[PDB]
Amino acid sequence: LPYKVADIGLAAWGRKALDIAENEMPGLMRMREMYSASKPLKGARIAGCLHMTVETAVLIETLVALGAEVRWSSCNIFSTQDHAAAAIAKAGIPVFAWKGETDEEYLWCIEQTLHFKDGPLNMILDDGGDLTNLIHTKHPQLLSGIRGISEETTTGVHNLYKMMANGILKVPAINVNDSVTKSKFDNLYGCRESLIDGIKRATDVMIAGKVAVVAGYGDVGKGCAQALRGFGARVIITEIDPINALQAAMEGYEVTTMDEACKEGNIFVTTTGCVDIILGRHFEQMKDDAIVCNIGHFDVEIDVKWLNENAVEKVNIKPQVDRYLLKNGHRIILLAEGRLVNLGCAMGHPSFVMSNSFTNQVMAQIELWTHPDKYPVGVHFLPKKLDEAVAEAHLGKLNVKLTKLTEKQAQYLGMPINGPFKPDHYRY
Amino acid sequence: LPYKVADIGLAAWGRKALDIAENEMPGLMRMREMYSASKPLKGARIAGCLHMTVETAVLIETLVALGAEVRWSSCNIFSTQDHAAAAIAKAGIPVFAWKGETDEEYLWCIEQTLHFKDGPLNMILDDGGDLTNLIHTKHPQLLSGIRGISEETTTGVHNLYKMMANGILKVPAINVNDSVTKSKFDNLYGCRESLIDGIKRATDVMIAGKVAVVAGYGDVGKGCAQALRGFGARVIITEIDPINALQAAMEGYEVTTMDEACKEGNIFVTTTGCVDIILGRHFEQMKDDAIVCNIGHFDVEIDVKWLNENAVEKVNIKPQVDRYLLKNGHRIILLAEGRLVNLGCAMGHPSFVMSNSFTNQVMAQIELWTHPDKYPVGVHFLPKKLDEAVAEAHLGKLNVKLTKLTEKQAQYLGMPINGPFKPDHYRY
Amino acid sequence: LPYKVADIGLAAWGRKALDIAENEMPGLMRMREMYSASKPLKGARIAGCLHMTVETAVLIETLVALGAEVRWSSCNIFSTQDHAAAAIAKAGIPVFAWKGETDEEYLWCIEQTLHFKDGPLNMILDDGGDLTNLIHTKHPQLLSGIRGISEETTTGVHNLYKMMANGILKVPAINVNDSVTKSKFDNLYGCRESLIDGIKRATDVMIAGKVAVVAGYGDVGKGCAQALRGFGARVIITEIDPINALQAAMEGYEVTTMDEACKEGNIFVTTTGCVDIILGRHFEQMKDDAIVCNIGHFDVEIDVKWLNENAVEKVNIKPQVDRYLLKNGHRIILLAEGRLVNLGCAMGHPSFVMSNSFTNQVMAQIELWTHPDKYPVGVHFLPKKLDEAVAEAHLGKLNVKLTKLTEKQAQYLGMPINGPFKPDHYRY
Amino acid sequence: LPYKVADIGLAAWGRKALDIAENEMPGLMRMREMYSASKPLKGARIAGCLHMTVETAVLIETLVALGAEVRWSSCNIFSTQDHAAAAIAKAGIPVFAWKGETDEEYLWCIEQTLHFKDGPLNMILDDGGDLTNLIHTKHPQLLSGIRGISEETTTGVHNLYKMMANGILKVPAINVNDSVTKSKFDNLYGCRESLIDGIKRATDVMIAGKVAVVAGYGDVGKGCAQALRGFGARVIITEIDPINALQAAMEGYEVTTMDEACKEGNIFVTTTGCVDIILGRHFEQMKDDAIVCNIGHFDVEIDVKWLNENAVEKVNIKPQVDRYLLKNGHRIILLAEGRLVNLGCAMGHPSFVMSNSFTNQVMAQIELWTHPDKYPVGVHFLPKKLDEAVAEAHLGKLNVKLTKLTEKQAQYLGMPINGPFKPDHYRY
């Protein structure tokens, strides 16, 4: 097929969005001005499996502008924004995705990107193992023609590692997930901004003066706490890792166990990425009308089945907002049914944060492709100098003035004027 | 007529809204558990003129629950939430209000609240001066029958002082507007919570890393500055008063003139309450896609007409979000048409802030009513013990444990154990 | 006598300090550039009772530089810095003060400033009742020749008020203590900077990760909390006033009672200005080696007698640092023996803050003297425009750019381009 | 000789110091209560070369309490606190150290720690490389007798890598310098606490309202910026690395070049660790009385010679505080002669930060010693479970309640309940 969007008529609407986003995504735009001549991806036939949204569309066109031939599929049945896919389809790009697909239409869409006008894909841009998987299990003949892979998710990267272990990984991968520019944004900065958006949009609740308990103090936890803290709330953190617990303490946050914190919190945010964070025994302790939500792993953190199964009432107050009544007579306001509150009750992360994650994708794609034999099969990390590069693509928009190391300082520090500035073990 | 609501069908739904807001309006709830049995307002016939909302309905039932007789109407033609009005009328309270009234129906609505079964109104609860102006200008027969006035707005209060200056004021008034609990929650705390919600709902923009220029550093300016700062923006302040300016400087904020700041910021917030804050000469200097919103005085602060008259294009991006292309090639994203961004792009202030302003009002009603021979015709401030009292009604929900001064300490401090704890010139 | 310093030889050492301070005290220096021509105090014969320190010395010379004839005495037997008094004495100014005087030498010193070469004092600049008192009870003949008084302490002002009440106040006063520029600095900004200085210098203790309980949340408590909070500690506040308790809560601080907080705090700071804040019953609860100190009222806040009388051991670890051993086997580190920790274990407030407090003194002196009959007997507040003036004397050093109201905005706001910008009830 | 301390008379006083520091060094205290009975270091003959301080003494007694045989010396000629040295010697531990040693006595002091009654050293605990270099260059006979090396400095560690690169390293080493708990407390947290202390002790200057320019934004830069920020200064960052620079921008800090910042700041802090940060061309642009200090690399960051060779005057205001008059009329206040302000003008890092660096050392010692056939000749990192372990030894004093992962969650997360909790590439 030429492509498949829900309403190509929505294409004019999307472009308008794409163009506003471009301003907030200076990364992908610098890639365009830096390479839309050298056309570095000239030759690449990139199959991409990634949520078809405005930001992703801006990514796609950056790939296309750098000389890449591209076919796209959304890695989530609902994540795709139709006016954005409409614009791409209209742009003459083979996009197969609409909001509200079936598992059937989903697998179909992905398969629809494997074959180009002059041969099958020779590159992969994945979010969530799916694309690398489908080809690995149901189309292994293609593997040899694929020069590389770029993966930007925890899941996908664990898989590339598992697959590697089992010797299934046939094509070299580049883990963009752990880039400091991708992680700090996708995790810390994104959640810091979008968390309170979900809460306010869903409840319009005053945050100042409330006690907010945050399970987990990893990047997402650090951002969620900082955010709440700046609003006027008393953040209590819970942790299993002594190093992360120490960091919380050093910053002035109380750190206890949920078994205790549940009796004190007014808002509860989970960040763990692990099961059984908030249980029935916790709900029974909570104050009347506590707001409970999650921004870590899709629904495995809060025990919603208990709420559904033990509450005396449940009344949907609005989309993504339920308020249960317990036998103790206390209500509990649950957000997005335990799913992600920022994507579920708000719009998820700002374009600027996507600019960092997606610019990481472009950086991987250009490197793998332009580097035929330097990367062995297996999941490798994005070379730091490239990581430094995506950071540098955003200064400017931020009106930051990087100072240049002089030849004398360079030699003194024993580092190139623009080569990597920190060793591979440097935690920033 | 017994009432006049756009639709009494939303009543059952209005109640739903009310029973949820009550939880965030502990001020109104303590007033009840504290005076509903005793009925201090027993005998008062209160005419109220104040935006008919969920939060205001909670207030009304509090006044009613204290032995008051009440007739109500809005103080703005649109402000009135119909399901809230419907439930008030459904409860048997005479409310003459609906969203979208014609200027003609508004006056009529006020007229209805002036007479009760047992007689005319003997108490005014105003927000704006409308009721008090109407009663004076068009109903002076009633003046000698009204025991007291209760006002909570700057416009309304200025009006009172002006009438009194002209010797036209004939009934004592209490200015609840300048109570620390009214002012702090309405100006400082309210806008701190909501400013960013407006900007995000309208633009979904990343705040961190942006230079935000806030004009003014009064209560609104302080809250707006603090908010943006907690998000990661580099706030720059502008001011005319050396003291407020010094306060900003002492907190780490740069303080300049708009004439210089315009060349730098990405987000502009007005908090002044004065005219001609952002003129075209400034717009011509702004960076591409600067966001310019106002949260101070409705429309006077930004030169919107200039935008309208000098932009090459103008496109509505979504309700309350407009984007102008200027002759220099830059785009100016203007929010709420230069009107209050919190009210125009968000949902205004949280119930909790309302709980402070309204408890201040219940307080004023109770006191004026209960001390007929206490207040000379004039516009007085709320006794500090009452201001502290409204503050205390909220401790508790805040999980605050207030300590009680012993008799020795009270004696050492020379203040009553419960009596006011600060002199009238105490700025908190 | 010509004067009386401990060691005039120390006079060269002083001038060196005076000159460095001048830089951080832009206020008194702008007074000099604005008035060392008009010589507004020409004629005044100012007797001054203020701690003879370097800052005060910079003050004195400003007075002298503005045409004033001056005689000085220190309002505290130990507060006087000899190299500073030495420079003044050397400069040809009658200063009678040395660190470590007797109550006898103290009263003597004060009397030594009542008479000038050409008659007795005609002005008074006091800090702590003393000067106004001595003349009022032991030299009432002088009262008539005294044109005005400037008082800048809570004590002194309560007294001016009490005296006024009793009809004893013969000469008009101006309370500089409550100026927003004097108060915010003397209380908020000063203590915020100096508190941790005392604790660190005395203990060299890590602040981050500790629970710090602050009694009181007025200006001093706000500053102390903010200070600790920025170092990484978890500040718990205790209050008797509901309004101040609300402010703490709204800022994210837990607010309890000392009865509870004593069991949790690692550092304790009292800000109250009231007796019995920390008692024996609290020490018995405290964690091992808690650091307890005070920065409010001299010694009445912490129960030191209990510590002395119940501890099993006490060992002075260094000047202003005692460590008690309780019967429970827990130690308690006490600072400056319950006296002010910033003055006692550090250097008190920075010059820039004294600049604000003292410039208020110069302001009052110039106003009273220059305004022969506009001030009736009684303690008056420093007119706002003068308060705005001292604020503006410091912008510039701070490199702040005040923006000027245009004639159009001025009229719109109904205020002068430079006249007072806020009403008398404005709490900043 | 059994030891060699400048004076063993301070012993009883040293102990006093030690018994106080112990409370703030829970890491060392837990190792004892955890391993003193079991004596894991039983048999080890540890030669240690580390600044002989109170904090270091606590460490020594810990290694001792764990069954280790120890001989010690400093790793700097001045660093060694004599009363601390005296107490260790007084307890029967062979310490060869005193403050103010000649370069010649230093080498000798080291030599002493090389031989024990039962034989030569079989373990190295080094701070700087000296011991390890001396053993290699001057005592290779001993090499095959030493089981392992423990190093905690950048210099020392770079040395290990270099020797290992030249194939000279003959004994395995563990780099405790790059453990998160060592780095975070030494670079980030330590400096955060002490930087401002240095500036205050040296200048007693008001920080709020000043523009502070921090050169660099690594761990030291981060803590220094955060510190100054909490005081009310407007921090401006300078950086060569795009990522760190983005990090600063994402927090609100302006990022420019020193070439521009010099014209604006009032306080200047270097954190770079690189040469030529503040040159004469910058000095000539600074405002009057700017403060310029260094907290990074000893003396290389600021061009002091320039000051010395181009200032018209130069005056020592107090130890470690010098002030230069430049030909342009401005004065430059330089602290610690361009050396580490925290150590030169304050008391260095708090015991608690040292408690982290040293528990890291006890850890490495215990591990290498207890795993003879585990480490290949080379410089390794501290196993993450040990790093998490030193972190946990401090939770507790911090009033932190670490939660334990259930077997289910453990299995869901795919990590041991106690085992490491993050991959090696995890940047906290």
Ligand SMILES: NC(=O)c1ccc[n+]([C@@H]2O[C@H](COP(=O)([O-])OP(=O)(O)OC[C@H]3O[C@@H](n4cnc5c(N)ncnc54)[C@H](O)[C@@H]3O)[C@@H](O)[C@H]2O)c1
């Ligand atoms: N937009 C979004 O909503 C969004 C964005 C990015 C990442 N995430 C997801 O959020 C989750 C956390 O990501 P992160 O990057 O912050 O992870 P991380 O590994 O940095 O942090 C996880 C933290 O949770 C802690 N934790 C684990 N089990 C715990 C337990 N049972 N109780 C308390 N604390 C516990 C861990 O110790 C760890 O410190 C992941 O699921 C990530 O995939 C969501």
Ligand SMILES: NC(=O)c1ccc[n+]([C@@H]2O[C@H](COP(=O)([O-])OP(=O)(O)OC[C@H]3O[C@@H](n4cnc5c(N)ncnc54)[C@H](O)[C@@H]3O)[C@@H](O)[C@H]2O)c1
């Ligand atoms: N919900 C809302 O959106 C909401 C809520 C409360 C108040 N307000 C309105 O917001 C505005 C500000 O109120 P406030 O309580 O903060 O007032 P305020 O008087 O406390 O603060 C106004 C400040 O703006 C400064 N200012 C005046 N003219 C200026 C100029 N021309 N340039 C720069 N700075 C200037 C003044 O010095 C003053 O400090 C008012 O109109 C107020 O009524 C809006």
Ligand SMILES: NC(=O)c1ccc[n+]([C@@H]2O[C@H](COP(=O)([O-])OP(=O)(O)OC[C@H]3O[C@@H](n4cnc5c(N)ncnc54)[C@H](O)[C@@H]3O)[C@@H](O)[C@H]2O)c1
């Ligand atoms: N350099 C210094 O150390 C310095 C400087 C300025 C002022 N002060 C002094 O410190 C004290 C505080 O002054 P301020 O300006 O902050 O005062 P304030 O009047 O603004 O605040 C005092 C606070 O203490 C609270 N309080 C009273 N009794 C209390 C109690 N028993 N328990 C808990 N809270 C209690 C009060 O409610 C009040 O909020 C005063 O004695 C002042 O004279 C010290």
Ligand SMILES: NC(=O)c1ccc[n+]([C@@H]2O[C@H](COP(=O)([O-])OP(=O)(O)OC[C@H]3O[C@@H](n4cnc5c(N)ncnc54)[C@H](O)[C@@H]3O)[C@@H](O)[C@H]2O)c1
């Ligand atoms: N007690 C103390 O005073 C103490 C304690 C620990 C570390 N340090 C020292 O402080 C220094 C910094 O250590 P760190 O841990 O922060 O290191 P780091 O590498 O983490 O930080 C250094 C940063 O400075 C930046 N930088 C380098 N050259 C620059 C230049 N020319 N101009 C501007 N920015 C530049 C780099 O990009 C880097 O981000 C080191 O010398 C370290 O050894 C001092």
